[PDB]
Amino acid sequence: QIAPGQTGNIADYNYKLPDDFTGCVIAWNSNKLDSKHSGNYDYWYRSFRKSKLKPFERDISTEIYQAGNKPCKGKGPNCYFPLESYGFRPTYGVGHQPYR
Amino acid sequence: SNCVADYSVLYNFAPFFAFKCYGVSPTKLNCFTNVYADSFVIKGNEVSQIAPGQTGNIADYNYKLPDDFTGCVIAWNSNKLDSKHSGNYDYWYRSFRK
Numbered sequence: 001q002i003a004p005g006q007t008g009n010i011a012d013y014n015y016k017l018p019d020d021f022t023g024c025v026i027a028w029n030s031n032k033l034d035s036k037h038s039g040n041y042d043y044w045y046r047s048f049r050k051s052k053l054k055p056f057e058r059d060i061s062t063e064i065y066q067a068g069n070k071p072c073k074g075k076g077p078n079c080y081f082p083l084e085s086y087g088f089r090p091t092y093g094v095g096h097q098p099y100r
Numbered sequence: 101s102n103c104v105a106d107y108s109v110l111y112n113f114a115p116f117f118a119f120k121c122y123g124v125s126p127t128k129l130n131c132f133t134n135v136y137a138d139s140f141v142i143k144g145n146e147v148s149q150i151a152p153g154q155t156g157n158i159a160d161y162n163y164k165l166p167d168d169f170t171g172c173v174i175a176w177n178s179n180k181l182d183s184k185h186s187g188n189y190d191y192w193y194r195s196f197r198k
């Protein structure tokens with residue numbers, strides 16, 4: 001998904017490249033350094049947002065997002081935290097392993 | 101079945117505590133051939149084990165998602181049925197696998 005014109009939860013909500021993009025995307029497999037046996041929860045990604053991102057914008061808001069119809073406060077009545085942790089583990093497969 | 105699927109019923113039904121996804125959160129805009137819905141009841145300690153590629157005692161033997169499962173999964177409180185102090189059984193899946 002780290003490529004011009006792609007869609008998905010990262011291309012849409014965390015990081016987007018412009019369609020007219022010149023540059024290089026270099027991905028390294030980092031399991032040795034980022035994974036923990038209990039899970040590395042220092043890395044968070046945004047799963048909920050109201051709209052798609054524009055090129056090179058950085059949304060660092062932590063305001064609670066609601067997927068439902070009744071405007072709620074706090075967490076759990078259809079109000080969700082916009083970010084979710086991913087516990088990286090040495091035992092995950094190639095597609096679930098961390099990459100830098 | 102001349103069905104158009106609206107997921108406002110699901111947000112209205114109950115205050116779901118867990119709602120994970122791999123596609124998108126609205127999950128209504130999206131067509132697909134089948135929704136192949138599955139349901140079951142789990143202890144609220146292994147909820148994070150119902151995920152693509154996630155190892156654990158739950159799901160790895162009972163119900164697993166192999167990889168790139170459409171992520172959308174949801175979980176809400178079952179206390180209205182679970183009230184017996186000694187327990188019962190009706191909704192249980194295969195306990196574990198050899």
Ligand SMILES: *[C@@H]1O[C@H](CO)[C@@H](O)[C@H](O)[C@H]1NC(C)=O
Nearest residue numbers: 051053054057058059060061
């Ligand atoms: C930038 O500010 C506008 C306010 O008009 C807002 O709609 C938009 O979401 C903001 N974007 C970011 C990345 O903060």
